[PDB]
């Protein structure tokens, strides 16, 4: 149960904030859990998703599909992963968007900002 007077339990307000959040907020919103090995290594439960990230799908029809995040569609809260597509009528390939919470990261895209974020969150590198 929430107690803070600055915390709103209104469903209307919560939905408005979620569906109207800007790109910076949506980046934090689109977060994926780390694998078990990554959890031991970095002492971090989950991180926001990013491009060039190796993930495997846990839910949905494309379960057990390993791939690297090719793009992050924050406008639609979707992740476009490599080789995760479906055939259109004419034979072209249309990528299938996957929610961030439905995938688990198996290999981070390490950089200065990513390492600084991990250390800031209190995790081993």
């Amino acid at each position: 149960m929430k107690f803070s007077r600055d915390v709103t339990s209104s469903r209307r307000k919560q939905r408005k904030a979620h569906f109207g959040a800007p790109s910076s907020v949506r980046r934090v919103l689109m977060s994926a859990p780390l694998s078990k090995e990554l959890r031991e290594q970095y002492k971090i439960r989950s991180l926001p998703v990013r491009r060039d990230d190796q993930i495997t799908v846990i839910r949905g029809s494309n379960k057990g599909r390993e791939g690297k995040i090719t793009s992050v569609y924050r406008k639609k809260f979707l992740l476009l992963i490599e080789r995760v597509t479906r055939e259109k009528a004419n034979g072209a390939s249309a990528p299938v968007g996957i929610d961030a919470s439905k995938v688990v990261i198996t290999k981070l895209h390490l950089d200065k900002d990513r390492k600084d974020l991990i250390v800031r969150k209190g995790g081993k590198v």
Binding site: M1, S9, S10, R11
Partner: protein, 260 residues
Amino acid sequence: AVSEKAGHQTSAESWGTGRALARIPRVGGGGTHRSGQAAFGNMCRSGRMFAPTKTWRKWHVKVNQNEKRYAISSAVAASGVPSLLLARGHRIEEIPEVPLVVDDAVQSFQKTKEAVALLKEIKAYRDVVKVANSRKLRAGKGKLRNRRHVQRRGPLVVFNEDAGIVKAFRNIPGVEIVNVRRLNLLQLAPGGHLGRFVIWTKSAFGLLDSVFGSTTEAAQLKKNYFLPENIISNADVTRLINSDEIQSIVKAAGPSRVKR
């Protein structure tokens, strides 16, 4: 309440008779769907509702303090009756004793794990399981108004001193923790139905006499308050009727059923 100007933000006047139209006021002008349409009527689309709701309606109801104390005392006495708890729906079949009084070390609990373990040891966890199983989605439009989930009521833990018991028990579904000095009728008889399962601490149970007093001695925590007197001394009217003193003086038994 609805807006005070709802249905009035328009300039509509009746056109009278002779136009082969109802005498309801109509919107003037032209060039839009609204032109010529009726207004200001409770029977009219986009009009003013009949008897618009006002904010100065009597929302709050006053009850005499003596009547409130009577209801609270009745709720406490009802909670002390094991049959009423079962009737109200509390799973108290395996409870060791009613009223259930626990040691004062419960007031110093620090973890929900300890609270759950104590409930299991005193066999009061069945109510929590019942509440968890009964949790469902509300039927109707209350979901749209921040009332999505409904569930049953579990045990009511009454304490005297707060040393962590409130925080250790608050996350358990159905469990409500209250101080003994501020017993609430909404919790003691939820829904107007008597027989709420109450778990007392030793200090709270000991202070119950100070809180309520007796019929002849006033409570020290309520100024000049005495417990109500009942209009009947012995409520076992079946025993009184079948007692020897009455059966010795009554007439013949009489036929319960008579032949046609």
